[PDB]
Design a protein around this nucleic acid. Structure first.
Ligand SMILES: Nc1ccn([C@@H]2CS[C@H](COP(=O)(O)OP(=O)(O)NP(=O)(O)O)O2)c(=O)n1
Ligand SMILES: [Ca+2]
Ligand SMILES: [Ca+2]
Ligand SMILES: [Ca+2]
Ligand SMILES: [Ca+2]
Length: 341
DNA sequence: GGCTACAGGACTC
DNA sequence: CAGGAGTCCTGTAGCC
């Protein structure tokens, strides 16, 4: 199989640049203002200008400002980025029916039947990079390999504004050399408990007792890593269908007071229903982020669709449930709908 | 034993 | 100083 992965560069930031070219060349920081106090919130993402100085996704906005006080701080305008995204996804579909839109920012294309080899695949990569630049002036990075995991690693190595092919030999080389931390799906926690078994590379999973790998990191995860080490990994490119829709908001104040939280919970429901469009969920979950950043939740599945009214009442019951079974204070409250009809 | 629901865990962008 | 949205897996407990 031949997979061609497309990853838009500093997507949110670049879209802002396309809409306002004077930004070009400056450090741009796209932010999620929380509402609690001046500059409370976090960085959603930033361009390379800002990034090369340590301003990265997830850090607090005030910390970003300490590092880059004169950078441009823009509020997230997701709907805008989503519309530009949708248009680019449509361009990619001209290249293949077997397409997987993994996020607002990435897409996997199976071009096995469009191209004969990696040479023709690389060339198809330039063709795509060019198309997107012509139509939307967005630069992207193209990763190419025999499966989704290595096509993504390929792009991770070539961004930004790049294109890279990882043929069969480098796959073998990477299995040996590549820091297993850089493997998609392995975060700090997993990587810590991995690399602490001397497993620092994909190969190391082959020589360790299985019940043991699986003891530290779970079955699915160990099979995944091993199948990759054996160069026997295969996951087809697939149309993705959204399985949940939700909304979570940050309260001005942390609270444990039911009447004080309801307003937030209710607004989160309204926004959620809106996004459901015509989907009818059978399940609802009330999600709360506590005082200390711990996530708690209580849900319920119904044998029928959930009307907005039923969502309102059930959410309060679920919220009460949380309040009763957890003495902590809530800082963020929301809901998530799933199991659509 | 294994399938279901539910709640938490970990990860990705 | 700690936003937001969405996905997959696992441990536990009911049940067949
Ligand atoms: N922690 C994070 C990470 C990403 N984001 C959002 C979700 S999608 C948008 C992608 O922006 P981005 O900077 O282009 O992400 P990348 O790491 O792919 N940058 P790139 O090198 O272009 O692929 O960032 C976020 O809100 N919070
Ligand atoms: Ca990405
Ligand atoms: Ca990107
Ligand atoms: Ca063509
Ligand atoms: Ca990692």
């Amino acid at each position: 199989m031949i997979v061609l992965f497309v990853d838009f560069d500093y997507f949110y930031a670049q879209v802002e640049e396309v809409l306002n070219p004077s930004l070009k060349g400056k450090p741009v920081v796209v932010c999620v203002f929380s509402g609690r106090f001046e500059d409370s919130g976090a960085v959603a993402t930033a361009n390379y200008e800002a990034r090369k100085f340590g301003v990265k996704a997830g850090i607090p906005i005030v910390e970003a400002k300490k590092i880059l006080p004169n950078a441009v701080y823009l509020p997230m305008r997701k709907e805008v980025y989503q519309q530009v995204s949708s248009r680019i996804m449509n361009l990619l579909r001209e290249y293949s029916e077997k397409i997987e839109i993994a996020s607002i920012d990435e897409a996997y294309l199976d071009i096995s039947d469009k191209v004969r080899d990696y040479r023709e695949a690389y060339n198809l990569g330039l063709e795509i990079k060019n198309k997107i630049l012509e139509k939307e002036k967005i630069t992207v990075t193209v990763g190419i390999s025999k499966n989704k995991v290595f096509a993504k690693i390929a792009a991770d190595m070539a961004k930004p504004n790049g294109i890279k092919v990882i043929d069969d030999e480098e796959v073998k080389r990477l299995i040996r050399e590549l820091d297993i931390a850089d493997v998609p799906g392995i975060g700090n926690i997993t990587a810590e408990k991995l690399k602490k078994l001397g497993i620092n590379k994909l190969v190391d999973t082959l020589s360790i007792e299985f019940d043991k790998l699986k003891g530290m990191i779970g079955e699915a995860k160990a099979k995944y890593l091993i199948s990759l080490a054996r160069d026997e990994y295969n996951e087809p490119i697939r149309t993705r269908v959204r399985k949940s829709i939700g909304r979570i908001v940050t309260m001005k104040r942390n609270s444990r007071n039911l009447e004080e939280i309801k307003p937030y919970l209710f607004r989160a429901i309204e926004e959620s229903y809106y996004k459901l469009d015509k989907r009818i969920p059978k399940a609802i979950h009330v999600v709360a982020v506590t005082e200390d950043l711990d996530i708690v939740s209580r849900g319920r599945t119904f044998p029928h669709g959930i009307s907005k009214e039923t969502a309102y009442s059930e959410s309060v019951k679920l919220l009460q449930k949380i309040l009763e079974e957890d003495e902590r204070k809530i800082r963020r409250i929301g809901v998530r709908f799933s199991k659509f009809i």
